Amino acid sequence: FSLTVLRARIALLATAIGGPPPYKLGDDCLACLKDLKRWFKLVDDQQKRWDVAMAVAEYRILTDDLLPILIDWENKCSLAAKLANKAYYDKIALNCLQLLVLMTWPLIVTEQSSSNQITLYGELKKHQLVYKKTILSMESGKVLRAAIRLALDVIKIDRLSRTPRDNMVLKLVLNFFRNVIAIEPGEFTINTKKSMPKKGITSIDTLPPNVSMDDISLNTVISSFHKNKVFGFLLTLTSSLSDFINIPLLEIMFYFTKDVNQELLFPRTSAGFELSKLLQKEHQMRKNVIKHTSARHSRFGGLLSIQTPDKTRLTVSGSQALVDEKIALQKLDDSKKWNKRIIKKEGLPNSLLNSQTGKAIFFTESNGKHFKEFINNFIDSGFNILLHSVTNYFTTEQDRMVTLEQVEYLLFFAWFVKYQLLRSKIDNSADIKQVSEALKEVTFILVSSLLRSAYDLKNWTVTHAGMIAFNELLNLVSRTKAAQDIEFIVSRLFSDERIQLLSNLPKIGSKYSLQFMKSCIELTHSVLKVLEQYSVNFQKVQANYMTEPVIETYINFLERFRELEDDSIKKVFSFFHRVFVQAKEQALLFRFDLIILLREMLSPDGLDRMSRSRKYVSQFSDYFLARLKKRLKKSPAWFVGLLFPPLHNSEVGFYQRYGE
Amino acid sequence: VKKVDDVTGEKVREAFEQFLEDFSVGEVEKVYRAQIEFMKIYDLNTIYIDYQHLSMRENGALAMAISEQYYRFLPFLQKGLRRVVRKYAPELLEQTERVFQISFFNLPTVHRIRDIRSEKIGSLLSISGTVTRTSEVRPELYKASFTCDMCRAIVDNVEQSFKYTEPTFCPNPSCENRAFWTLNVTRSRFLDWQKVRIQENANEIPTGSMPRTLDVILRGDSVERAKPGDRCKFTGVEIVVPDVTQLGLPGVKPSSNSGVTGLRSLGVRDLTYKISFLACHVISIGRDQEVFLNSLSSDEINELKEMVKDEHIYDKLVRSIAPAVFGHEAVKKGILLQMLGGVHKSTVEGIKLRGDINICVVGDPSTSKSQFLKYVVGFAPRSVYTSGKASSAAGLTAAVVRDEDYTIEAGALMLADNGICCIDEFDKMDISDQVAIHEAMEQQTISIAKAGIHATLNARTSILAAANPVGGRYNRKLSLRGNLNMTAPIMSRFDLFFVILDDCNEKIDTELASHIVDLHMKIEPPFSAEQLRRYIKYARTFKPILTKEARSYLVEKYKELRKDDAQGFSRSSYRITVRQLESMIRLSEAIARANCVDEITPSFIAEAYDLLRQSIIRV
């Protein structure tokens, strides 16, 4: 009975505000706006119900009433700003935007959260997408042009002349930008209280019919940003950095770039050439597929017996097996219906924290061109200044930072410092000094301390937020060394204290997500190349790398060849290639896991024949087989020792791993 | 939620996007951008995309990508369409979500029912065949939206397969539901669904072999666009429809050639498959004055303006009717007046007044009657050709046939509704057959009460009969009544009687032979057929009215007709009834329509009186 009364009040407020067909402000509009604000605030935190927002979304208040308020105020604001009760006509938009940011606030569910919040999270996440869907498509999304008025009114006055109260207005308006663009589809929380049936989840599309994946992607957000001029707003806000406009702004312009790769920026009928190439690749893989299918129908009945050792007469069907004995053996292998158990595992805005390499958001060519220059202009305007502004705050309240701050800060830092270096690599028009300002000693030691502290608390996500920056630390050290003593103080503290941390993560993180494993291989590849120009010892750092779990975690990445790219396979294979003659530690490489992956590599079903990956790999595997034959021919026990793991006995450790 | 994306799919989507938004194809014009604006104007959601335009762009790469894997690429094409339509104008999507339907037409090649192979599944075809049966327009579930019976959680956008697939799990982690849901019919999206049964064309059937049939599914705006009998050229994806009985349904059970098995949802039963086309576009290959004018191109408007302002337009039209027939100007004039017709007035009491003109071309067996009938049936729209021999079981009017209930078989007089029913050999059809059309020729309705069926069917047709005289050759020594087997009730319903004779004239035969041989060798009409058709359509919009003096002249002419037709000692008219007065009115209206004038002058009534008088003074 309480819920339907709440619905009655929401409907009563809906018909009290007014409507169209020009929208009309009803009597006591401010009073009803304040009443709605008070009710929503009371039910949000004081009572923790999350039901008033639901009723508002139901009456389509945000679309039918709230948006037209700002749209109707926009023309009056333009007329007043071009002509040359303004306070009453200005304060009306304040409450509307305060309501908008409150409803657009992301919803977080944890164990401490009550059942109502988790129950309504799945029913309100779709409405969250609805809000951003209707906002972006509302006549070029001009509501953001009205939003920036709620900031330029306060920022216009002198910064030293700021207001102890009006200062919260800037935070409230700024939160709206980061809230609207952080809206992403949620997860279908399957009810796992009982065993699931012989069929899985039917539909994973968490989108209401009014919401389409076309109209909610970050491409739409970036197009709306460009068409609403707010690029100038974001540039001018950063141009006047010289506190409260730093923490929100850290993620206001980061959300749409939290997971967008920089490779799509440069291509390296224009879109149709890649279309033709992809058609060629899929034609090749389909051609490889049909090599197994019989020339005739399945019911042709091709039966055979393999005269296997012991004169066995095992019967396996299939005319395909009559072509090759290997096909018959594979049909023998996959005939078994028994399988083992494979164990498996975002609380913060989804991104690298949960995005596979192929999740490249489609961009319009014009939109891509605009976004290419927008971020470059931001870097040329205020990048290092913004970093130095938050350097002081980062040095304090180390234990007072919620896990959201690390994931929203470290990813931003690493992504932009990586983008600057790749942009400088592709084109020389950008100086390295534009990113060289991040080599400050205090910033480096603080970020390293955060990375090491995240290890002991089992905060794997926060630690993965740190490796992505640690890779670019070594990359930038190399870039500023080759293109050149400031780099020494940043790249000499990893002598004894930091070697354990970098040499332990690969041995333990192999039982987690793919990206966690991908971080460590890049770390090792970068660290093996930064020190090559000075060699504290080349033969000593590599000694701690040649360990069996390290080889296991490197070879576990190779099993995903159906999705590994040229560089992903290149780094993994080059790690073993660079130690073939420089280290000569191939004895630990003698597990069957690498041999079966080599068989998969050279097989046409794996790597592409026309590409430039399988040729050098095939030649190196040809040499690998020669090494295997030479080492196996000299030890009969090594024929079966190749399968079993190595031993801890003293004499055999040098007898087998080194051959006396 | 981790979902892998087929990069080829988004590449095809982007290429389709650029093709749609910047095609700009004889001056440069973005035809598809204007097409999307056209859709916004009238809210229609069918994008007729020519395949040649898609093939010329991207040097055919995108065209091949579509034509090979259409079924998998279709959702990406829809998303690319949504991108462009939203970018140009967000006037889509009491919000009512808009579902789009991409239509591809003008494919380079056209297949047939015989050329169906299972290796073309999931590809674009252009199947052509003759439709023999069409089902009802039923609404099929497209994007379901279920609400679970407890906790009232809404599961939405549940994609539907050929089955009645419903969600298996509840998003709220407190609802126990694996088979219990209540579909929200109001929230769900439905699509028009029609199943047409096409077959091989007659000329494509090998001798002896039975025609091969197919079941083509029509969805969206392409429903009811393929009527039975019409040879259509369907185009769309070719799919295969499984036996949903084996898949398991909430309300039925599997019922008992090579069926595969082993699916988790199947168990021990097998699954059989049936090829069925899924058409996305179908085309057949076999009104105030201002409204008509606005639908006509300016170049045609010029030609029509030249006609209407002409001085000798009437005689030119008369000479331009059936150019391949030599002589017979009176019959040409009568045929011309037939197409224009009268005004189908309806009085205040509800009595309907006939406005159609009936002609009967009686003539010697060597004359050109059937040529006139064939020209009319080949020129006048909604016209049929039939004989008195009564070919079909249904007569000239209608019949009831038992189904092994009763149903109505449409006769010749009904298929030509609102048109011309060119009846040939009007004498051959028997007197017991003439009594059927007495009502259909005057009251213009056919009333049938046979068995469990009772209907008053509509026949608003103008009959152009062609009857040979009794005895083969016309006998001028007798009146028109003697030479024709028709009786007075049916002879009075014909407005005009035209008698054409092959007089044994040595000279006339020379012009006839020179004319026929001249045609076979190659007639110059002052108005071509397509040029005259628009004039007739324009003139039909006129509804002439009788002026005050026209009424007096009409009454006087009718009095003269009845006075000159008086017979017997009791002064009992035989040939001229009030139907002849209504015939004078109808002919006056038709003549005034020929001159494209909205007022009927006494000159028109005098001409109509001459036309009637010449058909009865035959003694």
Binding site: A11, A14, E58, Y59, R60, I61, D64 | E94, T186, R187
Partner: peptide, 14 residues
């Protein structure tokens, strides 16, 4: 107490 005018301004989407 809604007027006939409110009836015309749908609040519930459907």
């Amino acid at each position: 107490e809604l007027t006939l005018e409110s009836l015309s301004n749908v609040k519930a989407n459907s």
